[PDB]
Design an enzyme around this catalytic site. Structure first.
Site, PDB file in Angstrom:
ATOM      1  N   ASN B 190       0.804  -1.229   0.000  1.00 20.27           N
ATOM      2  CA  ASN B 190       0.000   0.000   0.000  1.00 20.27           C
ATOM      3  C   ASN B 190       0.834   1.275   0.000  1.00 20.27           C
ATOM      4  OD1 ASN B 190      -2.313  -1.859   1.745  1.00 20.27           O
ATOM      5  ND2 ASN B 190      -2.948  -0.653  -0.053  1.00 20.27           N
ATOM      6  N   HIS B 192       3.251   2.251   1.972  1.00 28.12           N
ATOM      7  CA  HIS B 192       3.643   2.761   3.283  1.00 28.12           C
ATOM      8  C   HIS B 192       5.047   2.212   3.608  1.00 28.12           C
ATOM      9  CE1 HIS B 192      -0.301   4.251   3.969  1.00 28.12           C
ATOM     10  NE2 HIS B 192      -0.873   3.052   3.828  1.00 28.12           N
ATOM     11  N   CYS B 227       6.695   7.712   8.653  1.00 29.74           N
ATOM     12  CA  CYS B 227       7.578   8.438   7.741  1.00 29.74           C
ATOM     13  C   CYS B 227       6.930   8.218   6.364  1.00 29.74           C
ATOM     14  CB  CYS B 227       9.003   7.888   7.783  1.00 29.74           C
ATOM     15  SG  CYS B 227      10.064   8.451   6.418  1.00 29.74           S
TER      16      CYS B 227
END
Ligand SMILES: CC(=O)N1CCN(c2ccc(Cl)cc2)CC1
Ligand SMILES: CC(=O)N1CCN(c2ccc(Cl)cc2)CC1
EC number: 3.1.2.14
Lengths: 269, 268
Positions: B190, B192, B227
């Protein structure tokens, strides 16, 4: 994994892991490259060669000689999905004065269809001086008994993509990703940057829109120089082209010393 | 891999790969962390939960709710060598108001000895607003049938290392590694940044002399903020002592905290 019946090739099956897939829920080209390296290492272990990535003999080790990748060429037709089982067959062959070659065939375990293929060219070098040197007959003879001697090519075609000369990208590059540095996970057991990291660095300068709307079909990468643990790299890409093609260059952030060059071919989803 | 006989835990075996080992020819802590994540994912798949790392239900998916790691604590006694088979058992338990927990036990397949253990604390939150949300009874009830209800702890010692509060590193840091950025291999399906990358970033500010002469025995990491793909991180470390270090990951620009943690190293 195991050597095949004739003992001249090695096969291994792998189940694709959750952290090994990209946005498409299928294995990335870096996961594929890691698997090719893994099966090459298991083939070396199965017949008594070193298992550090250099596949050396005792004779080579006392002379501080190693086998190093000069070019890697990978072509993927179907990336395996998360949870799929991929079977990989690998073999090696001598190319006399040019150096040596390792080939791979990737198959879907369920259907038996060829989903990908790869080839790599290797040269012998002194580990300390980095000077290339011709393989002696006594060293060569230890390897030939594990290779098929009739030509067995993953890429047999007349003037196939795996043998094309790659030009040097000229400034300005169309796209760039600067200041790339390796971390400890990018290093192998001997603290050298893993060959797979350079594949990741090349792809960093591809625009995300291309990645989102295309699949990587072919990647060819020439290795000219090693990036050290404390080096910083710039990744440069320029479009050369239903299909998209790019010319790539990796060089040191400071003096612009070339470490790699390559080309990629992408197909619209 | 498979669910155990009582169906309240999951076990899987892994053979250590050539690219998975460090200079000691044994698996790195990042390889171990990747394996813990993998077995947690396979446990979710085996009982019908999402397989994206958030282990959600259909009800959570329509409300845009996810499970997020708040803390990861890993203790390794023996790192498996290249070619060794490591067996990992994982289970999860509800901690009511505090959130939820996933535990792991790592064993050497040949001897059956415990070579490592890990625990992680999770919280429920809306994926868009990032606001923490209390788990409803109807959502909780779908998970309890897959958890042991008698306490089963990988770290049972009363107020042990896994539960210690971590302080914030004060400038100047003793050591630092600046300008760390994630590449596409550091991202999950996804897009991330994978939790294991933050472990790698924390360890980047450890001096190589420590890595060369010590083995990492314990790591505790608190996750405060994500982050993003285009963020740049600074990794800070100060010795607090065996060798012990205090760690801090913050954004390169404004110094916004993303993680804090501690590591414990044993002389080889
Ligand atoms: C590590 C690796 O894959 N390789 C490629 C094949 N190699 C080889 C050497 C000598 C002969 Cl005669 C044939 C093949 C060198 C090492
Ligand atoms: C992703 C992950 O590892 N987990 C384990 C802990 N989780 C859980 C949720 C509710 C209840 Cl009652 C118990 C446990 C959430 C999913």
């Amino acid at each position: 994994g195991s050597l095949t019946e004739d003992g001249l090739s090695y096969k291994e099956k792998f189940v694709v892991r959750s952290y090994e897939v990209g946005s498409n829920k299928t294995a990335t080209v870096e996961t594929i490259a890691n698997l090719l390296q893994e099966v090459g290492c298991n083939h070396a272990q199965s017949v008594g060669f070193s298992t550090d990535g250099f596949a050396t003999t005792t004779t080579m080790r006392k002379l501080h000689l190693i086998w190093v990748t000069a070019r890697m060429h990978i072509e993927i037709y179907k990336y395996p999905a998360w949870g799929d089982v991929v079977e990989i067959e690998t073999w090696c062959q001598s190319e006399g004065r040019i150096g040596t070659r390792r080939d791979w065939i990737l198959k879907d375990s369920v259907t038996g269809e060829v989903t990908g293929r790869a080839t790599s060219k290797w040269v012998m070098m002194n580990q300390d001086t980095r000077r290339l040197q011709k393989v002696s007959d006594d060293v060569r003879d230890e390897y030939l008994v594990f290779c098929p001697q009739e030509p067995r090519l993953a890429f047999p075609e007349e003037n196939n993509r795996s043998l094309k000369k790659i030009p040097k990208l000229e400034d300005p590059a169309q796209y760039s990703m600067i200041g790339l540095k390796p971390r400890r996970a990018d290093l192998d057991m001997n603290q050298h940057v893993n060959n797979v990291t350079y594949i990741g660095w090349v792809l960093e300068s591809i625009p995300q829109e291309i990645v989102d709307t295309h699949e990587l079909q072919v990647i060819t990468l020439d290795y000219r120089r090693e990036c050290q643990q404390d080096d910083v790299v710039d990744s440069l890409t320029t479009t050369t082209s239903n299909d998209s093609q790019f010319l790539h260059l990796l060089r040191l952030s400071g003096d612009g010393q070339e470490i790699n060059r390559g080309t990629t071919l992408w197909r619209k989803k």
